[PDB]
Design a protein around this ligand. Structure first.
Ligand SMILES: O=P(O)(O)OC[C@H]1O[C@H](O)[C@H](O)[C@@H](O)[C@@H]1O
Ligand SMILES: O=P(O)(O)OC[C@H]1O[C@H](O)[C@H](O)[C@@H](O)[C@@H]1O
Lengths: 452, 452
C-alpha cells in the first residue's frame, strides 16, 4: 500500500477516450501524406545522373565505347544537347495528369468508400513509381516508355489529398486552426526531407533502386492504412465535432478573378525549387549527386520553420493575409543574394537555404485558408454550399496549372544560363504579392476598430 | 453509412480492459530481465581478446616492444601462462557476490517499494558494468581493480529476479503455466542471444566499448521501468487474479536433501557453457573474436526451442519430471559427439550447437517448478507458508553455489586440455539425472491409474 502510481501512467491516464481517437488519426494521416511526398520526390534527385560529364569520368575497363563516343556516361534518350528540354517534359507529364486528376476526383471521388479508395491509391501509386525504376534493369531506351509511366502515375496519385481532408474534417469539422494543426501541415515537407535522404543512397551506382525502395514503402503504408482507418467518429462511437452552369456568373464575383492568378504565381515559385534545385546545386557547386541531394534538404528544414512561425503569428494577429505579403515581398532580395554570393563558402549557403526556404514555402500553406476565409462572407452566403464548392473548385483548379507551368518554363530557360531562371522566380513573387488590392485593404481597414 | 469497421480495430476491440493490463506487464518484465542478461554477457565474449597469440599478429609500426617481448598483444595482468586461471577467478568474483546477494535479498528485499528497488537496481547495474569498460581508456593495469568492480556488480545485480517474480505474481497469482508463460521464459535467452551480437561489434579494436554500450542500454531501461511499472492490480483497478531455527528439522524431510544436490549439478553444466564457450570455439576452430561470439549464439537459439517444446510436452503429459530425465540422460551423447567430430565442417556444428542447446538449457527452466510442485504436498502442509519459504530458500540457495563452482572448476582443468572439461560436463549430467529416485518413482506410480 506504499507504492503509488508511476509518473508515466499517471500522465497517460489524464487524457479522455475521445482524445486518443482524435489523436491517432493525426498520426495515421501524417504518415500517409508524408509517404506520398516521399514517392513523388526521386525524379528530381536523379537528374544529375541520367546525363553527366565524361571529362571528369574515368575511362572504362570494359570496352563499351568507340574512342570518340562520350555518350557512354549518359543514359540513352537524355544524351544530346537537349538534356534539359527533353526532361522538362517528363517533369510535367506527371503534373498535367495530376491536374486533370484533381478535377476528375471532384466527381467520382465521394462515390467510393474512403478506406477502399485511399488504400487502392497507395498501392497503385507504389506500383507505377517502381515501374519507372525497373527501366534500369530491363535497360529500356525509349522516351515513350518513361512518359506513359508518368502519365499514369499522375492520374493515380491524385487520390491522396481529397481523402485526407475528408478524413480529418469528419473528426474536426471544416477548418480547425491551432498549434497542433500547425505541426500537422509539415507532413508535406517531412516527406521531401526524407525522400531525398532515402533515395540519395543508390544514386551513384545502380539508380534503379532509387525508385524501387520508395515504391515499396508506399505499398506497405497502403496496407497499414487498410488495416487501421476510421472515417466517421460514429463508427467507434466517440463524440462528433462541435459545429460552428453557374461558371459564367462566378467570374462576375469580385473574388476569384484575382486569387486564381495568385495561386498560379505562388506555386510556380515553390515547384521550380522542388524539382530543379538538386540539378542547380550540382551544376554550380560541381558536386556529385549525393552531395546535391543532401544539400537540398536544408531548403525543406527552413520550409518547416516558415510554416510554424507564420502560423503562430497569424494567430496572435487577427487576419492571415498581411503576414503573407511580408514574406512574399521579402523573399525576393534573399533569393537574389543567394544567387549572388551564395555558392562559394558553405557557411553562407547553410544560412541562405534555410532563409529562402522559410520565406518561400511558408505562405504556401497559408494563402489558401486566407482566401477561403474571405470567400465565406459574400452576398452568395455560407448557406449556398454548392456555390462555395464551385468557386473553390476554380481556385484550386488553376493552382494546379501553376504546377505544370513551373518546370516546363524552367526547362526551356535553363540552357540559356541559370541567372535568367532566378530573374523569372524573383518576378513571380512580386507578381504574386498583388493580393493586397483586396485582402490587405480589408484587414488594415478593420484595425482602426482597435482605436475604438 | 457504407464503410464498416476495419479488420485491425475490430480485432483490437475484442480484448477486455483487464487483458491489456495483464498483457503489457509481460512486455515490460520481458525487456527488463532480458536487459539484465545482456549486461551480464560481454565478460564471456572478450576473453579471447585480453590474451592472444602474437605469432599470427602482424608486427607494429609504433615501437612498443623490445624485440623479445611478445606481450604487447596481451592485456597486462592476463599475460603469462596462467591466463586461464587468473580469469576463472574474475568470472566467479561476480557469481559469489551474486550468491550472497540472492540470500541477503530474502531479508531486506520486501522492505522496500518495488518500483524504487527495481529501478535503482538497473541504474547501479549499468554503472558498475561500464566501470569495467572504462579500464580500457584509463589503461589501468591491475588485477585488484577489475575484481572489486565485479564484486560490486554481483551484489547490485541481484535485485533483478526477486522483483520480477513478485511483479508477475501480483497479477497472475503464484505459478501460472501455459503457452504464454512458456514464451515468457525465453527472456533469459534472448538476452544472451543479443548480448553477443551487440557486444561483439567493438571487440576487434577498442574493446572498452564492448562494456559501455550494454552499460547504457540497461541504464535507459532503468528509466523506462521507473516511468511505467504497476505493482499490484488494485492500483489501476483491474481484477485481482483468481486464487487456487527450523533448519535442522528441514534436513530431516525426505525432500530437499536430494534436490539441493540436483540444482547444484544442473547449473554447473549450463553456466560453463555460458561463460567458457566463446573461448573454446575460438581456441579450437582458430577464428577471431567476432566469429567466436556470433557462432556461440546458435547454442541459445536451441535453448529457446528446448524451453518451448519441453514446456508443451509436460503439459500434454501430466507430471513435469519424466520429461526432464529424458533430456538430461540424452544430452550426454550429443555433447560427446560434438567434442568428437563437431569442429571440422560447419554443417555439422550448426546442427550440433542447436541440439546440445536444446538438450542442456531446456530442463533448466523446468526442474524448479517440477520440485516445487512436489514440495507443496507434505505433512508440513501448504498452510505453513514460512516452512515452504524456508525449504525453498535452501534449494535456490545451493542452486547459486552451483553457479560459482562452474567456471572456477572450468578454469583449472582447461590448461590440461579441453577434453577433460567435457568429461566433467558429461559426468555432471548423469550425476544430475539421479532425481529419478523420487519424482520418477512417484510419477510412473500414478500412471497405473490410467488403467483404471
Ligand atoms: O500537398 P500538395 O499536393 O502540394 O497540395 C497542396 C495543399 O497542401 C499543402 O500542404 C497545404 O496544406 C494546402 O494549403 C495546399 O492546398
Ligand atoms: O535467470 P537466472 O539468474 O539464471 O535465474 C534462474 C531462474 O530463472 C530461469 O530463467 C528460470 O525461469 C528459473 O527456473 C530459474 O530459477
Amino acid at each position: 500500500m506504499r507504492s503509488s502510481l508511476a509518473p508515466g501512467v499517471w500522465f497517460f491516464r489524464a487524457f479522455s477516450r475521445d482524445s486518443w481517437f482524435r489523436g491517432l488519426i493525426l498520426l495515421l494521416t501524417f504518415l500517409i501524406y508524408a509517404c506520398y511526398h516521399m514517392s513523388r520526390k526521386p525524379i528530381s534527385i536523379v537528374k544529375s545522373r541520367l546525363h553527366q560529364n565524361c571529362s571528369e569520368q574515368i575511362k572504362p575497363i570494359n570496352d563499351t565505347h568507340s574512342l570518340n563516343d562520350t555518350m557512354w556516361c549518359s543514359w540513352a534518350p537524355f544524351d544530346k544537347d537537349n538534356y534539359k528540354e527533353l526532361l522538362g517534359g517528363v517533369d510535367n507529364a506527371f503534373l498535367i495528369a495530376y491536374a486533370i486528376g484533381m478535377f476528375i476526383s471532384g466527381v467520382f471521388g465521394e462515390r467510393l468508400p474512403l478506406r477502399y479508395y485511399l488504400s487502392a491509391g497507395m498501392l497503385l501509386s507504389g506500383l507505377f513509381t517502381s515501374l519507372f525504376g525497373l527501366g534500369y534493369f530491363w535497360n529500356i531506351h525509349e522516351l515513350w516508355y518513361f512518359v506513359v509511366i508518368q502519365v499514369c502515375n499522375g492520374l493515380v496519385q491524385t487520390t491522396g489529398w481529397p481523402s485526407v481532408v475528408t478524413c480529418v474534417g469528419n473528426w474536426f469539422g471544416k477548418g480547425k486552426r491551432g498549434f497542433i494543426m500547425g505541426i500537422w501541415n509539415s507532413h508535406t515537407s517531412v516527406g521531401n526531407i526524407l525522400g531525398s535522404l532515402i533515395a540519395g543512397i543508390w544514386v551513384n551506382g545502380q539508380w534503379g533502386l532509387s525508385f524501387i525502395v520508395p515504391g515499396i514503402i508506399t505499398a506497405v503504408m497502403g496496407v497499414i492504412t487498410f488495416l487501421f482507418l476510421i472515417e466517421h467518429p460514429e463508427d467507434v462511437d466517440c463524440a462528433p465535432p462541435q459545429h460552428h452552369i453557374s461558371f459564367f456568373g462566378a467570374l462576375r464575383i469580385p473574388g476569384v478573378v484575382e486569387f486564381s492568378l495568385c495561386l498560379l504565381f505562388a506555386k510556380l515559385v515553390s515547384y521550380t525549387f522542388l524539382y530543379w534545385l538538386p540539378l542547380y546545386i550540382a551544376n554550380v557547386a560541381h558536386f556529385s549527386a549525393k552531395e546535391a541531394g543532401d544539400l537540398s534538404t536544408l531548403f525543406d528544414v527552413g520550409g518547416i520553420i516558415g510554416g510554424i512561425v507564420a502560423g503562430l503569428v497569424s494567430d496572435y494577429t487577427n487576419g492571415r493575409a498581411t503576414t503573407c505579403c511580408v514574406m512574399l515581398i521579402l523573399a525576393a532580395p534573399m533569393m537574389f543574394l543567394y544567387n549572388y554570393i551564395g555558392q562559394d563558402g558553405i557557411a553562407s549557403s547553410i544560412v541562405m537555404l534555410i532563409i529562402c526556404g522559410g520565406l518561400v514555402n511558408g505562405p504556401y500553406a497559408l494563402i489558401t485558408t486566407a482566401v477561403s476565409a474571405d470567400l465565406g462572407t459574400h452576398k452568395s452566403l455560407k448557406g449556398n454550399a454548392k456555390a462555395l464548392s464551385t468557386v473553390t473548385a476554380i481556385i484550386d483548379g488553376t493552382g494546379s496549372i501553376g504546377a505544370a507551368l513551373g518546370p516546363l518554363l524552367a526547362g526551356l530557360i535553363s540552357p540559356t544560363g541559370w541567372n535568367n531562371v532566378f530573374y523569372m522566380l524573383i518576378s513571380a513573387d512580386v507578381l504574386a504579392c498583388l493580393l493586397l488590392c483586396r485582402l490587405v485593404y480589408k484587414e488594415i481597414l478593420a484595425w482602426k476598430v482597435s482605436l475604438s
